[PDB]
Structures are given as structure tokens and as C-alpha cells.
Amino acid sequence: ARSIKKGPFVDEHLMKKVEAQEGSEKKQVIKTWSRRSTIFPNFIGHTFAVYDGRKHVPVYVTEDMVGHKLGEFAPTRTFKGH
Amino acid sequence: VEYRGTGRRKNSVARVRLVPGEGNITVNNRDVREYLPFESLILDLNQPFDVTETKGNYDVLVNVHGGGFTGQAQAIRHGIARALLEADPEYRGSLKRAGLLTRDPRMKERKKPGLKAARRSPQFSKR
Amino acid sequence: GQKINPIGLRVGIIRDWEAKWYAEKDFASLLHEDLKIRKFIDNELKEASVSHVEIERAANRINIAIHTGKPGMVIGKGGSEIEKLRNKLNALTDKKVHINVIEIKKVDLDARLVAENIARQLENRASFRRVQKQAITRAMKLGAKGIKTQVSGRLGGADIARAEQYSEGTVPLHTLRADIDYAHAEADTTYGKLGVKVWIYR
Amino acid sequence: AKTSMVAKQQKKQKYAVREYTRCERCGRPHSVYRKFKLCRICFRELAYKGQIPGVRKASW
Amino acid sequence: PRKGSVPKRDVLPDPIHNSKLVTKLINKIMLDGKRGTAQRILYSAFDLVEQRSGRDALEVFEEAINNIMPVLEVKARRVGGSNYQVPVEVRPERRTTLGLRWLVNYARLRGEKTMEDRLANEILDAANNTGGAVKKREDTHKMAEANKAFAHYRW
Amino acid sequence: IRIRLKAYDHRVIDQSAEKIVETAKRSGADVSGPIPLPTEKSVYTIIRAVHKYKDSREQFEQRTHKRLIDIVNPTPKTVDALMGLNLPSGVDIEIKL
Amino acid sequence: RIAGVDIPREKRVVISLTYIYGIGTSTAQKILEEANVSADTRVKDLTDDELGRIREVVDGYKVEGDLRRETNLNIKRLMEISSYRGIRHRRGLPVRGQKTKNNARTRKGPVKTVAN
RNA sequence: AAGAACCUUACCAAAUCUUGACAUCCUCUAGAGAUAGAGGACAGGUGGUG
RNA sequence: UGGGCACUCUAAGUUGACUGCCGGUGACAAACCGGAGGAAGGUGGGGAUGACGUCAAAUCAUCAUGCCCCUUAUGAUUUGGGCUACACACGUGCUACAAUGGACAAUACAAAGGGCAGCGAAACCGCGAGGUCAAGCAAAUCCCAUAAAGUUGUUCUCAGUUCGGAUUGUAGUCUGCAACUCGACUACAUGAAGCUGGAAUCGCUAGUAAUCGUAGAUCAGCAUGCUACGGUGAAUACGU
Incomplete structure (x- = not known):
């Protein structure tokens, strides 16, 4: 995954709508389609409505989640047993 | 006084140069017992040296390339017989009796399509 | 699937290729130029009794030998008809002035x-x-x-x-x-x- | 569907990992060779007439 | 098969002991085309039985082979609900094939540490009329002894 | 001086092996014999069927035959007669020079 | 015995020391470079002064307990934040992304068959 | 199918369009991105019936 | 390496294997058995080549096509997801359950291919994937590239083990806008089932069965699949 020279990956438009509102106090429910963006340290206290394919499941970002892409936190398939 | 007798086995070609002298067998400028891993190859190599009595009487300067070691050993053996006639052409009366002047055509098989690799077939079940 | 194609079986042995040229590189574009010419010939010379179309290439020039059973229908009243064929092909990519009509008796x-x-x-x-x-x-x-x-x-x-x-x-x-x-x-x-x-x- | 995916393949995509190869003669997106830009089907038909230079049946 | 007989592939004499029998024993020990090991297995056992018995390595081997080779086999005929076990005397060529096979198989089935010691152990036991190799022929003879009543059903 | 030719057909490369040594000897010049170079066989394996019937493959080849002819004494009448290449529109010519 | 985990005696140091959890063969070979032990002496033929040198090196690495605790909190963290890896941990399924359709037994466990 | 991260994908969920994705004649700015702003007979259909 | 081109290779042409021959069994003749050269003997061995027809076998999703429908949709462009989901059953393979072995070091012997913005040497760094600079080669010239099984020694001493490497944790490499769904790999940690498989079952009479690696097509990346290439390499096949 990536490299050390390339570093972390966040979609070119995604962080723009993160450092857009951080000068304000309230977090938002920004609708998201990029599941491949790394959850950056500046992603803290921010609901990301990530598209699972049909819906925008919201996710409050805690410190531990920094490092994995928000796609890991958006379940795409559904299964209730057999 | 090089008696040039060619010899081919599988994918190997040996340039046998019979020269007079009692000594070892020098495969690619190396002793036969350092070149060939096993002695059984060295026995098959000296088959025409034994069928007609010339054992060790020549220092075979052989330049073999291709194949493994068994293919190279019999390519030398075939080349030796084709070179024993180069020294004395009245030697075939026992070489044909023991089948040493014939190029062995038992070369590998094609990978037959539809069948698993060579002549064998894959697993077969019934639906 | 019973019979092998008679033309494909005998090509190279007794038959000869229609596209006769060499291209170590740019083979894909040169070959598709051949089909592009042949396809255009197919509809343009439809009512002409055209049997084979050989495309040859040498010195950035495309040689076309069209074997037809109705010469004159392709050539024209001295060459007017073949001229339209040549320039219409000429408008495509390079120049292909050589067009030879062979009578099929x-x-x-x-x-x-x-x-x-x-x-x-x-x-x-x-x-x-x-x-x-x-x-x-x-x-x-x-x-x-x-x-x-x-x-x-x-x-x-x-x-x-x-x-x-x-x-x-x-x-x-x-x-x-x-x-x-x-x-x-x-x-x-x-x-x-x-x-x-x-x-x-x- | 045909005539839309063919034009899409002809159209230059954004990146260098989006383009793919289609048989220019028929539009098949699978098993297309690079030396002839033809699928395994179109290769057979054209090689049978002899319209692909130097290509003959192999019988080794 | 149906059309005549099939010529057999021959072997050359052993490099050391000069015995075609010895080389064919290597052909039985060999698995997956590995001649190297099989050649080492036998010479590490021929030279080993010399230290156990004392006599020549090939001399004990010849004695042992004779005590494994079967004299009377039992081929199967059929009349109906009863299958006729017809005892047939073993032709000389099949005897050596069976004796060599029973030496290897009943050496593999035993075990102390390695294959060389197992082979050497079975070689000496056969010359002493002991071991699985000689127990296989004793059962082969026994079945031929019991079914002498079917002798005249030999096709 | 290294004139080399590549051809898909062995007959036009044998004819190309000749016919230029003869225009080399047309002038006063020594030319090396046609060197038989290893041909390059490209093998293609395709499924005959238009769908699912595998294990039935049609195999095709394409042999590029190669030759090497070396002019040993290049005279002016050879460089002027070097354009007399009678290429049948399918024999690639590579004069290293 | 090293730091509570007894290693098999009558075994070579390089081989016996891998019996400790958290230490493998490549790590074990590292001890014998620092501690001057010939990697061939049996633990039963080992000298007490050699034991001290070995034991000093061992605790430097993440040897026992800590590695067990570390690996668990790593998975526990994956459980808490409900990622793709960690939810599959709950359900006992291959978390890397292997095919669970027909061949997954070291994660599914016993084959509890359903009749047809 | 001799090559499923996008493509391939022909499947699904959103953002969309309707002379059309294609014939044939008549450098900045938002925005997931498409795309947007600024520097008419006809087509098409991996739709059906081997 | 100068020089030769002798040998061998390379690829064009050209000999040879035709029951010519010698017997003997059939002289109803075809034929059949043995023998002689000869490299090859009885269609020399393999490949391509598949008749009438059969199965309304397969393909309207390669393509075209009679008819039937959609034609602001059954058409069309984008992002995301899915095609990889998992109670399980089936077919086809791979890996092992070690001592003819594991490991540890040295030491050999191929074939066939591919390569231009590709193959990418040599050097340097890195445990290693790999990275930095790079010569040469449009290639019998340079690169992939090193075959490995194999040989020689040392170590283990039958143990779920110095067998086995599934599965997890951590830190990384490459490619790609982007490896979470869902890539290949590399290190360190872990260490599953598995002690040679029941009833049944398939393949094969030579360079075959078995065994070891190499190459190519596709291809940014991705094969235990397929197609090809060689190395080692059994044996009874009496008999119907």
C-alpha cells in the first residue's frame, strides 16, 4: 500500500472540504464518495457520510481510526445469516 | 591424430577427438569422474571401448554442450563409436552387433493438446 | 466442425498470400489499412466481377492488383473509372497509385x-x-x-x-x-x- | 452495449490505466493480440484467406 | 497382449559388482526418476551386509534372491460362481522380477532408521530364510500347494 | 558493408540471398557468401470454437527468415548499383554501411 | 528456562530457544551473535555463565506476554472501530480478503454441514 | 474469460441526457465525477427467439 | 584470442527406406515370417488433415442475420459498489503429512522464446522485496538469465519434530490518480489441519508414468490456469 516516498493518500478534493470548516467550531455531515482517502490526523471530530454504494453511512472519526481509509468503516455488503 | 567422430543424444552434441595415449577421459577439459555425477554413466560411455577392445587407449578430447549428463554421456559414447571407425574402419563387425553406431531417436514427446501434457490424460468423472 | 477451410490449409504450400509485404513494426496499422482498402473495394466494385484483391506495399506506396472477370467495367472507357477508384483510395492516408486490373476469362x-x-x-x-x-x-x-x-x-x-x-x-x-x-x-x-x-x- | 463501448474505447480516457484493447475489426474486448490488433476469431478468418502476411498453419 | 509378444528393455551390468540383477534392484528403489539416491542406497547396503555376514556382498545377495524367488504362482480361472485359482509354475524371468520386488517392498515396510539399513537388514534375513520377503513366497507356494486339484485347468 | 535481409517467405529470401551477390559481382568486388541466419518463429495458439469448446486449438506460425551477405571490396560501382534491389515488396533490406 | 518459559533441554540453543513464544529462528540466530554461544551446545550441556549472556539479550526483544498482549490490543482496536478487518474477526472469517465461498476452514473452524 | 481497484462490466445505487455515446446527409472556477461556466429524417439496443 | 572456418551450429538445396534385396510360407495371388545392409524396416516416429451423417448438441454475447419488441429507453456519460458476497455440496489442481527428508554451505549440465521508449547489464545502498545511476542491444552481437532437480560434505535422529506453512499481528517494496472492499510481493512475530486417505475411481505398455525448473500469450500491476521448452527417468506387457 502506497510507499514511504509517496506517503499518505487523501483525495484531492476531500481534505479541501475538511480544512474548509476547521476554523469553525461545528463539524458537518459532508457527503463523501472517496472511500480510498486515508483518515488524516486533521480528520478529528468530523462526521463523514461515506458512500457505501447506495447510502451515506455517517462515521464519527476518533483518533484510533487515523491510518485506515474511511472505506474500511463503510460496510458495502450486507449479510444476515443463511 | 584426432579421429573426429560426432555423436548426438537427446539435446546434446559431443565433439569426440580420439588421440592415441593411455589416460583418463576429459569431458569439457575435466575428468569423467568429476564431470559425470555417477559411474553408471561412465560405464555406458565406455561401452564401445569394451565391445571392441580399445579400453583407455585414447584420450578423448570431447567438447560436449547441451542436455544434462546422461544425454551428454551417451552422446560421447555415440561419438566414440563413430570415431573408433575413424581410426580403424574394420571395427563395425562388432559395433553393429552391439548397436553402438545408431543415433538413438528416443527424444522427448510433444505436449499433446486436449490431453494432460504428454500421452496421459487428466482426471475423468461422471456427471 | 468437420471440414478445414480449403484456402487456409493450402496457403503457403501451393497458394500464396494476398497481403504480401513486410512490417517488423507498425504491423497492426499496415494490416488494418489492407482491410480498410479491401472493404472499400468490396462495396465500390460490387457489381464488377471482382474475385481477388492483392495489396502490395513497397517504398511508402501501396500496390493493388484487382483480379476481375469484367475488365473495362473497373478500368472504364480508357481509364476514367479506375481513376476515381485510385483517387478515392488516394484520399485515405498515403498514396496508392499502382492499381492493376487482371482479366478473369x-x-x-x-x-x-x-x-x-x-x-x-x-x-x-x-x-x-x-x-x-x-x-x-x-x-x-x-x-x-x-x-x-x-x-x-x-x-x-x-x-x-x-x-x-x-x-x-x-x-x-x-x-x-x-x-x-x-x-x-x-x-x-x-x-x-x-x-x-x-x-x-x- | 456495442457502438457505445467501442466509441468509448476509441475515445481517449483520462488516465493511462483506463484504456483497453478491442478487436478493431469486430470490437471484441477479450483475447485480442497486439501484433495484429485482432481477436482470436478475427485472426482465424483473416489468416485462412491469407490477408495477414506470412501467417500460415503450424504443423510442427 | 493380443498380437504376439513384446520385446523387453534390457539393462547393462552393474558398475561395481557387474550384475544386471544389481542394476535392476536400483531401478526398483528409484522413486521419481532419482537414480542418484537409488545407486547410493544399494552400495550403502551391499557394503553393509558384508560387515554383518562376512562373506562377499554379491555372494549373500545371490543366496538371498534364491530364497525370495517363487517357484509356483496361482493364476485365476473362472467357471462361474466359483473362481478357479489355478496354480501355474513361474517362468524364470518373472521369478527375478518378483524376487527383486518383494525385497524392496518388504524392506520399505520395515524400519530401523533409514532405507539403506532396512535394505541391508532384509538382505541378510532373506539369506537366513527369515523376513517378509521369504514369508511372501511361502504364502505363494502354500496357495499353489493347496490348489493342486485345479492344476489341469491351466487354459 | 553488412547487407542483411529479412523475409516472411523462405523462397523470396533464397532469391534475395542471390541476385545481390550477382550485382556485387557485376562490378569488380568480392562478396561474402549468403550467411544462413536463424529464422524467428512466432507461434500463436487460439481456440478454434467461437465460444466454449476448448482443448481444440488451431496453431499458426510466422517465420521471419534472415540472411547475411557481406561485401568485402566495396567499389564505387557497387554503391551506385546498391539501389538495384529487386525487392518483391515483402523482403526487408538493411544495409548497415 | 528463560524468564519463566522453559525451553526443551538436550536441544541446540538455536533450535530450543524458538520454543519461547515471540522468538523464531531468525531472532534466535541473533542471540548467538551477541551472546558468545556456539549455537550447537545443548541446553543440558550449557554453562551458567552462558545462560546469563543469553538471558540478558532475550528481554531486550519483545519476548513473552508483552507480544501476546500487543497482538490482542491490535485486534481489539480493530474490533472497537468496526473496520473491515475486525468485523470479520468477530464473525471468524478471513479478514485479508481470501475467498470465503468454498475454501475457508482455519477461520470458519469445524464443518457444520447443512443437509440438502 | 490468453488477465474484474476505475475501465473491462454488459450488473446494482446515486448524478444525469434525449437527433443523443456513434453514424448519414442536413488555462482558471465550483462540482465524487460526468459536466457546467469563464481563458431532423434517423440512430442505438452485450434486448428475445441457436 | 590473432587466425582459420577445420569440427559443431545456422538454413537452403539434395540423398536415403522403395518389401529394392536374400531366403522361406502362401505361386488363388495378394500377402506373412525371419535375414542383409543401413542412421532409420515394413504406414521409420510424431503433427496437420475429421466422409455420408448423428446429437433441433454449442454459439442471436465475436460478427452478421429472418421475424418480435424498446426507441426522453431495453438507448446513453459519469462516481461509488458488485462481479471476490458464505449454512454448505460438487468438479479440476497445488501443497504437504518428511530420513530416497528438513536445513546448512560450496559445486555443475539445457532447450525454447521475448525485447525500443522494451530487455534492461555493471556498480552502489537495503536483511529482502526492491531502489539510485547506468553500458549494451531493434539484437545468433546486448538483456531477460540464473535452470533446478543433480554432486560433494556438515547438522539433525523419528518427534506433530530443525516435517508442514494454512491463519493472524507488525513494518515495509513495486505498479498504478487511487491495493478498504478486491493486487502481487518482502522482512520480523505466530504456527492450523495434516502421521500417505474408506466405498468407489482414472491414466498409462519409453524417453512414456513419475519428478525438477525455464519461457511465452494476455498484461500498468496481477496464474497453483493454458500453451510450449528442456533435465533426470521403471517394467513385467506370458497370454485372450
């Missing part, structure tokens, strides 16, 4: 011409048996060692596909030292497509 001895002649009559509500027998009769009258003809699919407008095959003389399709001209044509009728195959051996 025995039209009924060419598989592609016989198959096309059969297919056009079949489209005009003709007997699928009379067209085969008459064409076969002409070729054998012309000295051919043997001719084989086959028409397939909804013969006469029926609801079930059939295959009427008639043969005369010797047509050995298993011998390789023999030039058997083979060609397939289609006849689009109201009831569907037809399949014409001809095996003329001389």
Missing part, C-alpha cells in the same frame, strides 16, 4: 464469381436446385476436373434449414498437392440468410 471457373452469381439469383426468388446444377454444368463444360456446390438454410423459404449439395467429377479436399478454389457467399432473402459454398478444382 473463365468467370464460371472462379469459385468467388460462381458463388456470387449463385447467391444473387437466390435472392431473386430462384430455385436453389437449378442454380447449383446449371452452375455445376457450366464449370464441368469448361474443363474443370471437378466442382462441388452447397446451399444451406431455409431452402425455398422453408421453416427448417437444409443443405442441398451437388457434386460432379473429382474434388479431393484431402490431397494437399491440389489447388481447390473455395469461396463462401451470403444471400440475404426475406426468410433469412443463405450459405453458398463452391469447390472448383482444376
Whole structure:
């Protein structure tokens, strides 16, 4: 995954709508389609409505989640047993 | 006084140069017992040296390339017989009796399509 | 799947290639230029009895040798018609000034011409048996060692596909030292497509 | 569907990992060779007539 | 098979002991085309049985082979609900094939540490009329002894 | 001086092996014999069927035959007669020079 | 015995020391470079002064307990934040992304068959 | 199918369009991105019936 | 390496294997058995080559096509997801359950291919994937590239083990806008089932069965699949 020279990956438009509102106090429910963006340290206290394919499941970002892409936190398939 | 007798086995070609002298067998400028891993190859190599009595009487300067070691050993053996006639052409009366002047055509098989690799077939079940 | 294609089997052995040029690189574009020319020739020279089209290439120049059973129809009244063919091809990519017309004297001895002649009559509500027998009769009258003809699919407008095959003389399709001209044509009728195959051996 | 995916393949995509190869003669997106830009089907038909230079049946 | 007989592939004499029998024993020990090991297995056992018995390595081997080779086999005929076990005397060529096979198989089935010691152990036991190799022929003879009543059903 | 030719057909490369040594000897010049270079066989394996019938493969080849002819004494009448290449539109010519 | 985990005696140091959890063969070979032990002496033929040198090196690495605790909190963290890896941990399924359709037994466990 | 992260994908969920994705004649700015702003007979259909 | 081109290779042409021959069994003749050269003997061995027809076998999703429908949709462009989901059953393979072995070091012997913005040497760094600079080669010239099984020694001493490497944790490499769904790999940690498989079953009479690696097509990346290439390499096949 990536490299050390390339570093972390966040979609070119995604962080723009993160450092857009951080000068304000309230977090938002920004609708998201990029599941491949790394959850950056500046992603803290921010609901990301990530598209699972049909819906925008919201996710409050805690410190531990920094490092994995928000796609890991958006379940795409559904299964209730057999 | 090089008696040039060619010899081919599988994918190997040996340039046998019979020269007079009692000594070892020098495969690619190396002793036969350092070149060939096993002695059984060295026995098959000296088959025409034994069928007609010339054992060790020549220092075979052989330049073999291709194949493994068994293919190279019999390519030398075939080349030796084709070179024993180069020294004395009245030697075939026992070489044909023991089948040493014939190029062995038992070369590998094609990978037959539809069948698993060579002549064998894959697993077969019934639906 | 029973019969190997007669042309493909004998190509290189007794037959020769139509596209005769070398291209270590740019092979894909050069080859597709050949088909682009051939496809344009197919509809432009449709009513002309065109049998083979050879494309040769040398010194950034495309040589086309068109074997036709109706010379003059392609050439024109001295060259006017062939000039339009040359410049229309000329407008495509490079220059291809060389166009050679070769007369096919025995039209009924060419598989592609016989198959096309059969297919056009079949489209005009003709007997699928009379067209085969008459064409076969002409070729054998012309000295051919043997001719084989086959028409397939909804013969006469029926609801079930059939295959009427008639043969005369010797047509050995298993011998390789023999030039058997083979060609397939289609006849689009109201009831569907037809399949014409001809095996003329001389 | 055809005539839209063919034009899309002809159309230059954004990146260098989006383009793919289609048989220019028929439009098949699978098993297309690079030396001829033809699918395994179109290769057979054209090689049988002899319209591909130097290509003949192999019988080794 | 149906059409006549099949010529057999021959072997050359052993490099050391000069015995075609010895080389064919290598052909039985060999698995997956590995001649190297098989050649080492036998010479590490021929030279080993010399230290156990004392006599020549090939001399004990010849004695042992004779005590494994079967004299009377039991081929199967059929009349109906009863299958006729017809005792047939073993032709000389099949005897050596069976004796060599029973030496290897009943050496593999035993075990102390390795294959060389197992082979050497079975070689000495056979010359002493002991071991599985000689117990296989004793059962082969026994079945031929019991079914002498079917002798005249030999096709 | 290294004139080399590549051809798909062995007959036009044998004819190209000749016909230029003869225009080399047309002038006063020594030319090396046609060197038989290893041909390059490209093998293609395709499924005959238009769908699912595998294990039925049609195999095709394409052999590029190669030759090497070396002019040993290049005279002016050879460089002027070097354009007399009778290429049948399918024989690639590579004069290293 | 090293730091509570007894290693098999009558075994070579390089081989016996891998019996400790958290230490493998490549790590074990590292001890014998620092501690001057010939990697061939049996633990039963080992000298007490050699034991001290070995034991000093061992605790430097993440040897026992800590590695067990570390690996668990790593998975526990994956459980808490409900990622793709960690939810599959709950359900006992291959978390890397292997095919669970027909061949997954070291994660599914016993084959509890359903009749047809 | 001799090559499923996008493509391939022909499947699904959103953002969309309707002379059209294609014939044939008549450098910045938002925005997931498409795309947007600024510097008419006809087509098409991996739709059905081997 | 100068020089030769001798040998060998390379690729064009050209000999040879035709029951010519010698017997003997059939002289109803074909034929059949043995023998002689000869490299090859009885269609020398393999490949391509698949008749009439059969199965309304397969393909309207390669393509075309009669008819039937959609035609602000059954058409069309984008992002995301899915095609990889998992109670399980089936077919086809791979890996092992070690001592003819594991490991540890040295030490050999191929074939066939591919390569231009590709193959990418040599050097340097890194445990290693790999990275930095790079010569040469449009290639019998340079690169992939090193075959490995194999040989020689040392170590283990039958143990779920110095067998086995599934599965997890951590830190990384490459490609790609982007490896979470869902890539290949590399290190360190872990260490599953598995002690040679029941009833049944398939393949094969030579360079075959078995065994070891190499190459190519596709291809940014991705094969235990497929197609090809060689190395080692059994044996009874009496008999119907």
C-alpha cells in the first residue's frame, strides 16, 4: 500500500472540504464518495457520510481510526445469516 | 591424430577427438569422474571401448554442450563409436552387433493438446 | 466442425498470400489499412466481377492488383473509372497509385464469381436446385476436373434449414498437392440468410 | 452495449490505466493480440484467406 | 497382449559388482526418476551386509534372491460362481522380477532408521530364510500347494 | 558493408540471398557468401470454437527468415548499383554501411 | 528456562530457544551473535555463565506476554472501530480478503454441514 | 474469460441526457465525477427467439 | 584470442527406406515370417488433415442475420459498489503429512522464446522485496538469465519434530490518480489441519508414468490456469 516516498493518500478534493470548516467550531455531515482517502490526523471530530454504494453511512472519526481509509468503516455488503 | 567422430543424444552434441595415449577421459577439459555425477554413466560411455577392445587407449578430447549428463554421456559414447571407425574402419563387425553406431531417436514427446501434457490424460468423472 | 477451410490449409504450400509485404513494426496499422482498402473495394466494385484483391506495399506506396472477370467495367472507357477508384483510395492516408486490373476469362471457373452469381439469383426468388446444377454444368463444360456446390438454410423459404449439395467429377479436399478454389457467399432473402459454398478444382 | 463501448474505447480516457484493447475489426474486448490488433476469431478468418502476411498453419 | 509378444528393455551390468540383477534392484528403489539416491542406497547396503555376514556382498545377495524367488504362482480361472485359482509354475524371468520386488517392498515396510539399513537388514534375513520377503513366497507356494486339484485347468 | 535481409517467405529470401551477390559481382568486388541466419518463429495458439469448446486449438506460425551477405571490396560501382534491389515488396533490406 | 518459559533441554540453543513464544529462528540466530554461544551446545550441556549472556539479550526483544498482549490490543482496536478487518474477526472469517465461498476452514473452524 | 481497484462490466445505487455515446446527409472556477461556466429524417439496443 | 572456418551450429538445396534385396510360407495371388545392409524396416516416429451423417448438441454475447419488441429507453456519460458476497455440496489442481527428508554451505549440465521508449547489464545502498545511476542491444552481437532437480560434505535422529506453512499481528517494496472492499510481493512475530486417505475411481505398455525448473500469450500491476521448452527417468506387457 502506497510507499514511504509517496506517503499518505487523501483525495484531492476531500481534505479541501475538511480544512474548509476547521476554523469553525461545528463539524458537518459532508457527503463523501472517496472511500480510498486515508483518515488524516486533521480528520478529528468530523462526521463523514461515506458512500457505501447506495447510502451515506455517517462515521464519527476518533483518533484510533487515523491510518485506515474511511472505506474500511463503510460496510458495502450486507449479510444476515443463511 | 584426432579421429573426429560426432555423436548426438537427446539435446546434446559431443565433439569426440580420439588421440592415441593411455589416460583418463576429459569431458569439457575435466575428468569423467568429476564431470559425470555417477559411474553408471561412465560405464555406458565406455561401452564401445569394451565391445571392441580399445579400453583407455585414447584420450578423448570431447567438447560436449547441451542436455544434462546422461544425454551428454551417451552422446560421447555415440561419438566414440563413430570415431573408433575413424581410426580403424574394420571395427563395425562388432559395433553393429552391439548397436553402438545408431543415433538413438528416443527424444522427448510433444505436449499433446486436449490431453494432460504428454500421452496421459487428466482426471475423468461422471456427471 | 468437420471440414478445414480449403484456402487456409493450402496457403503457403501451393497458394500464396494476398497481403504480401513486410512490417517488423507498425504491423497492426499496415494490416488494418489492407482491410480498410479491401472493404472499400468490396462495396465500390460490387457489381464488377471482382474475385481477388492483392495489396502490395513497397517504398511508402501501396500496390493493388484487382483480379476481375469484367475488365473495362473497373478500368472504364480508357481509364476514367479506375481513376476515381485510385483517387478515392488516394484520399485515405498515403498514396496508392499502382492499381492493376487482371482479366478473369473463365468467370464460371472462379469459385468467388460462381458463388456470387449463385447467391444473387437466390435472392431473386430462384430455385436453389437449378442454380447449383446449371452452375455445376457450366464449370464441368469448361474443363474443370471437378466442382462441388452447397446451399444451406431455409431452402425455398422453408421453416427448417437444409443443405442441398451437388457434386460432379473429382474434388479431393484431402490431397494437399491440389489447388481447390473455395469461396463462401451470403444471400440475404426475406426468410433469412443463405450459405453458398463452391469447390472448383482444376 | 456495442457502438457505445467501442466509441468509448476509441475515445481517449483520462488516465493511462483506463484504456483497453478491442478487436478493431469486430470490437471484441477479450483475447485480442497486439501484433495484429485482432481477436482470436478475427485472426482465424483473416489468416485462412491469407490477408495477414506470412501467417500460415503450424504443423510442427 | 493380443498380437504376439513384446520385446523387453534390457539393462547393462552393474558398475561395481557387474550384475544386471544389481542394476535392476536400483531401478526398483528409484522413486521419481532419482537414480542418484537409488545407486547410493544399494552400495550403502551391499557394503553393509558384508560387515554383518562376512562373506562377499554379491555372494549373500545371490543366496538371498534364491530364497525370495517363487517357484509356483496361482493364476485365476473362472467357471462361474466359483473362481478357479489355478496354480501355474513361474517362468524364470518373472521369478527375478518378483524376487527383486518383494525385497524392496518388504524392506520399505520395515524400519530401523533409514532405507539403506532396512535394505541391508532384509538382505541378510532373506539369506537366513527369515523376513517378509521369504514369508511372501511361502504364502505363494502354500496357495499353489493347496490348489493342486485345479492344476489341469491351466487354459 | 553488412547487407542483411529479412523475409516472411523462405523462397523470396533464397532469391534475395542471390541476385545481390550477382550485382556485387557485376562490378569488380568480392562478396561474402549468403550467411544462413536463424529464422524467428512466432507461434500463436487460439481456440478454434467461437465460444466454449476448448482443448481444440488451431496453431499458426510466422517465420521471419534472415540472411547475411557481406561485401568485402566495396567499389564505387557497387554503391551506385546498391539501389538495384529487386525487392518483391515483402523482403526487408538493411544495409548497415 | 528463560524468564519463566522453559525451553526443551538436550536441544541446540538455536533450535530450543524458538520454543519461547515471540522468538523464531531468525531472532534466535541473533542471540548467538551477541551472546558468545556456539549455537550447537545443548541446553543440558550449557554453562551458567552462558545462560546469563543469553538471558540478558532475550528481554531486550519483545519476548513473552508483552507480544501476546500487543497482538490482542491490535485486534481489539480493530474490533472497537468496526473496520473491515475486525468485523470479520468477530464473525471468524478471513479478514485479508481470501475467498470465503468454498475454501475457508482455519477461520470458519469445524464443518457444520447443512443437509440438502 | 490468453488477465474484474476505475475501465473491462454488459450488473446494482446515486448524478444525469434525449437527433443523443456513434453514424448519414442536413488555462482558471465550483462540482465524487460526468459536466457546467469563464481563458431532423434517423440512430442505438452485450434486448428475445441457436 | 590473432587466425582459420577445420569440427559443431545456422538454413537452403539434395540423398536415403522403395518389401529394392536374400531366403522361406502362401505361386488363388495378394500377402506373412525371419535375414542383409543401413542412421532409420515394413504406414521409420510424431503433427496437420475429421466422409455420408448423428446429437433441433454449442454459439442471436465475436460478427452478421429472418421475424418480435424498446426507441426522453431495453438507448446513453459519469462516481461509488458488485462481479471476490458464505449454512454448505460438487468438479479440476497445488501443497504437504518428511530420513530416497528438513536445513546448512560450496559445486555443475539445457532447450525454447521475448525485447525500443522494451530487455534492461555493471556498480552502489537495503536483511529482502526492491531502489539510485547506468553500458549494451531493434539484437545468433546486448538483456531477460540464473535452470533446478543433480554432486560433494556438515547438522539433525523419528518427534506433530530443525516435517508442514494454512491463519493472524507488525513494518515495509513495486505498479498504478487511487491495493478498504478486491493486487502481487518482502522482512520480523505466530504456527492450523495434516502421521500417505474408506466405498468407489482414472491414466498409462519409453524417453512414456513419475519428478525438477525455464519461457511465452494476455498484461500498468496481477496464474497453483493454458500453451510450449528442456533435465533426470521403471517394467513385467506370458497370454485372450
